[PDB]
Amino acid sequence: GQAFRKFLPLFDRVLVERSAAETVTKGGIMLPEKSQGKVLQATVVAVGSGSKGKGGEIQPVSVKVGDKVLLPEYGGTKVVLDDKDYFLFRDGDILGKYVD
Amino acid sequence: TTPEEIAQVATISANGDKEIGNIISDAMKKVGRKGVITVKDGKTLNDELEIIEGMKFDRGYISPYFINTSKGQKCEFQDAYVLLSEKKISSIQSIVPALEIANAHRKPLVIIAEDVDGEALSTLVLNRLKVGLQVVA
């Protein structure tokens, strides 16, 4: 796997940083801080070593560092790193990734 | 057929008081002969006539942060957009496009609703105070 700011997740756990939630719309109308919601869009910043589905073989993590992914509404766990937020997820919990 | 006869009738029926007849004839001339006139208690010595034109209703603003004129502690706009709703406006998406169409045309917005709850109130007052767009509820 790959470690991000001295943190290597184990197994198939993936560490993501949630993107900045919107605070203004296209026409200039700006939003309150409470009603921004929880953003489901993030970028994969760290990948685990991969879960051992069967003995004698290792299954790598499908996503890689630098891929824009769509997080589910539920299932993440809190990670604090130098007073910054990050979220740990399972590999199968990520709904999909953005290619460009 | 003449307002003088109306003044005479209102003077005679009010125990010979000429001022009551004059003010009733003035009200008849102002709001029409078949008009809505209501008698109210006064806090001064002499009776007075107040003519209320347009639409007036006994409802105020939702939040006291919508005040822009400090002379009478009222809120005044000229050539303003008005939005109306029979139901209570609650969600963010139900109030944003009205703000977009008020900001794009650069016109004031007054929203007549039942009640505006916390999230839409926060959106309205934050857009009023931060960027300076004009809106009342």
mmCIF file of C-alpha atoms in Angstrom:
data_model
loop_
_atom_site.group_PDB
_atom_site.id
_atom_site.type_symbol
_atom_site.label_atom_id
_atom_site.label_comp_id
_atom_site.label_asym_id
_atom_site.label_seq_id
_atom_site.Cartn_x
_atom_site.Cartn_y
_atom_site.Cartn_z
ATOM 1 C CA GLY A 1 0.000 0.000 0.000
ATOM 2 C CA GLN A 2 0.825 3.706 0.162
ATOM 3 C CA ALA A 3 1.202 5.855 3.279
ATOM 4 C CA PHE A 4 -0.064 9.441 3.472
ATOM 5 C CA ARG A 5 1.521 11.863 6.001
ATOM 6 C CA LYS A 6 3.011 8.958 7.993
ATOM 7 C CA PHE A 7 -0.143 6.828 8.133
ATOM 8 C CA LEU A 8 -0.462 3.451 6.403
ATOM 9 C CA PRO A 9 -3.968 1.926 6.546
ATOM 10 C CA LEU A 10 -4.153 -1.831 7.029
ATOM 11 C CA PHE A 11 -5.950 -4.472 4.900
ATOM 12 C CA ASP A 12 -8.417 -2.937 2.384
ATOM 13 C CA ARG A 13 -9.125 0.239 4.390
ATOM 14 C CA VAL A 14 -8.858 3.422 2.314
ATOM 15 C CA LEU A 15 -8.177 6.909 3.700
ATOM 16 C CA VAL A 16 -9.896 9.774 1.872
ATOM 17 C CA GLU A 17 -10.093 13.536 2.353
ATOM 18 C CA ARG A 18 -13.558 14.995 1.842
ATOM 19 C CA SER A 19 -13.703 17.852 -0.643
ATOM 20 C CA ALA A 20 -14.667 21.407 0.255
ATOM 21 C CA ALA A 21 -18.451 21.644 0.448
ATOM 22 C CA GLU A 22 -20.135 24.364 -1.579
ATOM 23 C CA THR A 23 -20.655 27.779 -0.002
ATOM 24 C CA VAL A 24 -21.923 29.783 -3.009
ATOM 25 C CA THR A 25 -24.014 28.853 -6.043
ATOM 26 C CA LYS A 26 -23.413 29.842 -9.689
ATOM 27 C CA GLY A 27 -25.525 33.006 -9.524
ATOM 28 C CA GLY A 28 -23.812 34.421 -6.438
ATOM 29 C CA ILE A 29 -26.221 33.219 -3.737
ATOM 30 C CA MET A 30 -24.162 32.037 -0.769
ATOM 31 C CA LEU A 31 -25.121 29.257 1.646
ATOM 32 C CA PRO A 32 -25.116 28.925 5.453
ATOM 33 C CA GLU A 33 -22.508 26.768 7.148
ATOM 34 C CA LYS A 34 -24.952 24.304 8.737
ATOM 35 C CA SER A 35 -26.972 23.565 5.579
ATOM 36 C CA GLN A 36 -23.907 22.602 3.511
ATOM 37 C CA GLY A 37 -24.556 18.947 4.368
ATOM 38 C CA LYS A 38 -22.018 16.145 4.288
ATOM 39 C CA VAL A 39 -20.186 16.058 0.960
ATOM 40 C CA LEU A 40 -20.188 12.632 -0.708
ATOM 41 C CA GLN A 41 -17.283 13.580 -3.006
ATOM 42 C CA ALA A 42 -13.695 12.960 -1.945
ATOM 43 C CA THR A 43 -10.197 12.141 -3.175
ATOM 44 C CA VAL A 44 -8.355 8.951 -2.237
ATOM 45 C CA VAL A 45 -5.217 9.998 -0.367
ATOM 46 C CA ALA A 46 -4.109 6.636 1.075
ATOM 47 C CA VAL A 47 -4.693 2.981 0.199
ATOM 48 C CA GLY A 48 -4.272 -0.132 2.308
ATOM 49 C CA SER A 49 -2.249 -3.266 1.689
ATOM 50 C CA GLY A 50 -5.281 -5.182 0.406
ATOM 51 C CA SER A 51 -7.465 -7.805 2.062
ATOM 52 C CA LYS A 52 -6.602 -11.510 1.887
ATOM 53 C CA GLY A 53 -9.742 -12.952 0.320
ATOM 54 C CA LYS A 54 -8.208 -16.406 -0.156
ATOM 55 C CA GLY A 55 -5.124 -18.065 1.269
ATOM 56 C CA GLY A 56 -1.950 -17.845 -0.785
ATOM 57 C CA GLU A 57 -3.059 -14.815 -2.821
ATOM 58 C CA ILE A 58 -3.437 -11.109 -2.050
ATOM 59 C CA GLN A 59 -6.145 -8.932 -3.601
ATOM 60 C CA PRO A 60 -4.963 -5.346 -4.199
ATOM 61 C CA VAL A 61 -7.040 -2.278 -3.421
ATOM 62 C CA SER A 62 -9.055 -1.283 -6.496
ATOM 63 C CA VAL A 63 -8.700 2.493 -6.068
ATOM 64 C CA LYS A 64 -5.366 4.338 -6.089
ATOM 65 C CA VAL A 65 -4.009 7.559 -4.616
ATOM 66 C CA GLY A 66 -5.292 10.491 -6.651
ATOM 67 C CA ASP A 67 -8.681 9.114 -7.751
ATOM 68 C CA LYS A 68 -11.866 11.141 -7.273
ATOM 69 C CA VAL A 69 -14.427 8.858 -5.615
ATOM 70 C CA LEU A 70 -18.053 9.111 -4.486
ATOM 71 C CA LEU A 71 -18.451 8.267 -0.798
ATOM 72 C CA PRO A 72 -21.609 6.714 0.648
ATOM 73 C CA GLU A 73 -23.653 8.603 3.204
ATOM 74 C CA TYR A 74 -22.851 6.033 5.930
ATOM 75 C CA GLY A 75 -19.902 3.817 6.825
ATOM 76 C CA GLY A 76 -16.870 6.059 7.356
ATOM 77 C CA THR A 77 -14.721 6.336 10.459
ATOM 78 C CA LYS A 78 -13.049 9.476 11.794
ATOM 79 C CA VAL A 79 -9.292 10.022 11.456
ATOM 80 C CA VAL A 80 -7.495 13.097 12.808
ATOM 81 C CA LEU A 81 -4.078 13.960 11.374
ATOM 82 C CA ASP A 82 -2.250 17.187 12.418
ATOM 83 C CA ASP A 83 -5.570 18.940 13.172
ATOM 84 C CA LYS A 84 -7.087 17.932 9.822
ATOM 85 C CA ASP A 85 -9.980 15.568 9.130
ATOM 86 C CA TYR A 86 -9.846 12.352 7.107
ATOM 87 C CA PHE A 87 -12.172 9.382 6.743
ATOM 88 C CA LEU A 88 -11.423 5.652 6.637
ATOM 89 C CA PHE A 89 -13.669 3.435 4.510
ATOM 90 C CA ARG A 90 -13.901 -0.159 3.400
ATOM 91 C CA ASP A 91 -12.962 -0.957 -0.188
ATOM 92 C CA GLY A 92 -16.438 -2.214 -1.079
ATOM 93 C CA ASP A 93 -18.205 0.752 0.515
ATOM 94 C CA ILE A 94 -16.982 3.176 -2.171
ATOM 95 C CA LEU A 95 -19.762 3.515 -4.731
ATOM 96 C CA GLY A 96 -17.599 4.475 -7.710
ATOM 97 C CA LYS A 97 -14.713 6.535 -9.020
ATOM 98 C CA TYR A 98 -14.401 9.450 -11.444
ATOM 99 C CA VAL A 99 -12.271 9.038 -14.572
ATOM 100 C CA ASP A 100 -11.090 11.947 -16.715
ATOM 101 C CA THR B 1 -76.807 63.394 -4.754
ATOM 102 C CA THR B 2 -74.352 65.830 -3.110
ATOM 103 C CA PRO B 3 -71.711 65.429 -0.368
ATOM 104 C CA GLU B 4 -73.357 68.363 1.439
ATOM 105 C CA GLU B 5 -76.437 66.212 2.088
ATOM 106 C CA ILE B 6 -74.162 63.430 3.377
ATOM 107 C CA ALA B 7 -72.470 65.908 5.725
ATOM 108 C CA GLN B 8 -75.876 67.173 6.890
ATOM 109 C CA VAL B 9 -77.140 63.627 7.569
ATOM 110 C CA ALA B 10 -73.983 62.691 9.476
ATOM 111 C CA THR B 11 -74.110 65.965 11.432
ATOM 112 C CA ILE B 12 -77.772 65.561 12.426
ATOM 113 C CA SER B 13 -77.417 61.881 13.342
ATOM 114 C CA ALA B 14 -74.369 62.652 15.541
ATOM 115 C CA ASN B 15 -76.301 65.024 17.865
ATOM 116 C CA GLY B 16 -75.579 68.173 15.873
ATOM 117 C CA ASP B 17 -71.785 67.810 15.798
ATOM 118 C CA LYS B 18 -70.443 69.437 12.632
ATOM 119 C CA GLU B 19 -66.931 67.963 12.895
ATOM 120 C CA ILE B 20 -68.227 64.373 12.888
ATOM 121 C CA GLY B 21 -70.332 65.140 9.820
ATOM 122 C CA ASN B 22 -67.377 66.783 8.075
ATOM 123 C CA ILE B 23 -64.997 63.888 8.767
ATOM 124 C CA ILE B 24 -67.623 61.313 7.720
ATOM 125 C CA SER B 25 -68.276 63.231 4.485
ATOM 126 C CA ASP B 26 -64.511 63.388 3.878
ATOM 127 C CA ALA B 27 -64.280 59.614 4.363
ATOM 128 C CA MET B 28 -67.247 59.167 1.993
ATOM 129 C CA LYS B 29 -65.449 61.256 -0.632
ATOM 130 C CA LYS B 30 -62.143 59.433 -0.134
ATOM 131 C CA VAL B 31 -63.071 55.726 0.016
ATOM 132 C CA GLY B 32 -66.367 55.979 -1.870
ATOM 133 C CA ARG B 33 -69.941 55.934 -0.630
ATOM 134 C CA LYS B 34 -69.927 52.123 -0.385
ATOM 135 C CA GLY B 35 -66.577 51.963 1.378
ATOM 136 C CA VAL B 36 -65.160 50.165 4.417
ATOM 137 C CA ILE B 37 -64.881 52.573 7.363
ATOM 138 C CA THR B 38 -64.044 51.373 10.879
ATOM 139 C CA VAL B 39 -64.236 53.281 14.163
ATOM 140 C CA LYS B 40 -61.229 52.892 16.459
ATOM 141 C CA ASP B 41 -60.097 54.248 19.806
ATOM 142 C CA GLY B 42 -57.804 57.271 19.733
ATOM 143 C CA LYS B 43 -55.006 58.205 22.120
ATOM 144 C CA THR B 44 -55.266 61.965 21.484
ATOM 145 C CA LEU B 45 -57.838 64.663 22.223
ATOM 146 C CA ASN B 46 -59.348 65.155 18.751
ATOM 147 C CA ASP B 47 -60.738 62.597 16.323
ATOM 148 C CA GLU B 48 -58.848 61.925 13.099
ATOM 149 C CA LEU B 49 -59.282 60.148 9.769
ATOM 150 C CA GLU B 50 -56.663 57.713 8.464
ATOM 151 C CA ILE B 51 -56.946 56.522 4.860
ATOM 152 C CA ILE B 52 -55.197 53.196 4.266
ATOM 153 C CA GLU B 53 -54.649 52.524 0.562
ATOM 154 C CA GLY B 54 -53.168 49.472 -1.069
ATOM 155 C CA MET B 55 -52.856 46.189 0.808
ATOM 156 C CA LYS B 56 -52.419 46.322 4.589
ATOM 157 C CA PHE B 57 -52.430 43.317 6.904
ATOM 158 C CA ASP B 58 -51.521 42.855 10.567
ATOM 159 C CA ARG B 59 -48.336 40.870 9.921
ATOM 160 C CA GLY B 60 -44.736 41.947 10.444
ATOM 161 C CA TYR B 61 -41.324 40.781 9.322
ATOM 162 C CA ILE B 62 -39.971 37.443 10.531
ATOM 163 C CA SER B 63 -36.597 38.660 11.810
ATOM 164 C CA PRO B 64 -35.552 42.150 12.989
ATOM 165 C CA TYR B 65 -32.344 42.042 10.903
ATOM 166 C CA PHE B 66 -34.263 42.904 7.698
ATOM 167 C CA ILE B 67 -34.501 46.601 8.636
ATOM 168 C CA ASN B 68 -32.631 48.918 6.261
ATOM 169 C CA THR B 69 -34.162 52.353 7.004
ATOM 170 C CA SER B 70 -33.278 53.688 10.457
ATOM 171 C CA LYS B 71 -35.508 56.789 10.390
ATOM 172 C CA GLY B 72 -38.769 54.999 11.174
ATOM 173 C CA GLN B 73 -37.307 51.531 11.846
ATOM 174 C CA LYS B 74 -39.245 50.261 8.821
ATOM 175 C CA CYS B 75 -38.058 48.551 5.639
ATOM 176 C CA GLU B 76 -38.566 50.231 2.265
ATOM 177 C CA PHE B 77 -38.024 49.042 -1.306
ATOM 178 C CA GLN B 78 -38.913 50.523 -4.691
ATOM 179 C CA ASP B 79 -40.042 48.345 -7.636
ATOM 180 C CA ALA B 80 -39.717 45.092 -5.709
ATOM 181 C CA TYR B 81 -40.331 41.484 -6.665
ATOM 182 C CA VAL B 82 -42.865 39.631 -4.527
ATOM 183 C CA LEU B 83 -43.071 35.850 -4.062
ATOM 184 C CA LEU B 84 -46.072 34.105 -2.505
ATOM 185 C CA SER B 85 -46.760 30.615 -1.173
ATOM 186 C CA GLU B 86 -49.807 28.919 0.338
ATOM 187 C CA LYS B 87 -47.561 26.430 2.161
ATOM 188 C CA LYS B 88 -44.744 26.910 4.646
ATOM 189 C CA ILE B 89 -41.358 27.464 3.009
ATOM 190 C CA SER B 90 -38.847 25.150 4.650
ATOM 191 C CA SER B 91 -36.247 23.638 2.346
ATOM 192 C CA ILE B 92 -33.139 25.313 0.965
ATOM 193 C CA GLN B 93 -34.006 24.394 -2.634
ATOM 194 C CA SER B 94 -37.444 26.017 -2.255
ATOM 195 C CA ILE B 95 -35.952 29.467 -1.547
ATOM 196 C CA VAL B 96 -32.666 29.540 -3.539
ATOM 197 C CA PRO B 97 -34.046 30.077 -7.123
ATOM 198 C CA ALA B 98 -36.084 33.086 -5.973
ATOM 199 C CA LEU B 99 -32.850 34.534 -4.573
ATOM 200 C CA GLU B 100 -31.052 33.748 -7.850
ATOM 201 C CA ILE B 101 -33.738 35.497 -9.900
ATOM 202 C CA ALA B 102 -33.708 38.460 -7.494
ATOM 203 C CA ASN B 103 -29.911 38.773 -7.659
ATOM 204 C CA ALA B 104 -29.654 38.362 -11.446
ATOM 205 C CA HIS B 105 -32.198 41.130 -12.098
ATOM 206 C CA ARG B 106 -30.925 43.225 -9.126
ATOM 207 C CA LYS B 107 -34.392 43.793 -7.671
ATOM 208 C CA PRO B 108 -35.702 43.551 -4.093
ATOM 209 C CA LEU B 109 -37.572 40.458 -2.953
ATOM 210 C CA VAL B 110 -40.430 40.217 -0.455
ATOM 211 C CA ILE B 111 -41.666 36.710 0.377
ATOM 212 C CA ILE B 112 -45.177 36.388 1.807
ATOM 213 C CA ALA B 113 -45.468 32.948 3.399
ATOM 214 C CA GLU B 114 -46.891 31.233 6.472
ATOM 215 C CA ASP B 115 -43.652 30.829 8.427
ATOM 216 C CA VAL B 116 -39.961 30.692 7.523
ATOM 217 C CA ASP B 117 -38.000 28.169 9.587
ATOM 218 C CA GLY B 118 -34.400 28.146 10.764
ATOM 219 C CA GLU B 119 -32.433 27.068 7.683
ATOM 220 C CA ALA B 120 -34.230 29.417 5.279
ATOM 221 C CA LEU B 121 -34.049 32.214 7.863
ATOM 222 C CA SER B 122 -30.294 31.689 8.203
ATOM 223 C CA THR B 123 -29.925 31.690 4.410
ATOM 224 C CA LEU B 124 -31.948 34.906 4.056
ATOM 225 C CA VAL B 125 -30.269 36.866 6.855
ATOM 226 C CA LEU B 126 -26.775 35.674 5.876
ATOM 227 C CA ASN B 127 -27.352 36.699 2.254
ATOM 228 C CA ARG B 128 -28.725 40.031 3.485
ATOM 229 C CA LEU B 129 -25.795 40.803 5.786
ATOM 230 C CA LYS B 130 -22.796 39.332 3.943
ATOM 231 C CA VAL B 131 -23.140 40.099 0.227
ATOM 232 C CA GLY B 132 -25.815 42.773 0.698
ATOM 233 C CA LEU B 133 -28.719 41.438 -1.373
ATOM 234 C CA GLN B 134 -32.100 42.786 -0.288
ATOM 235 C CA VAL B 135 -34.805 40.350 0.843
ATOM 236 C CA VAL B 136 -37.576 40.318 3.473
ATOM 237 C CA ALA B 137 -40.081 37.713 4.663
#
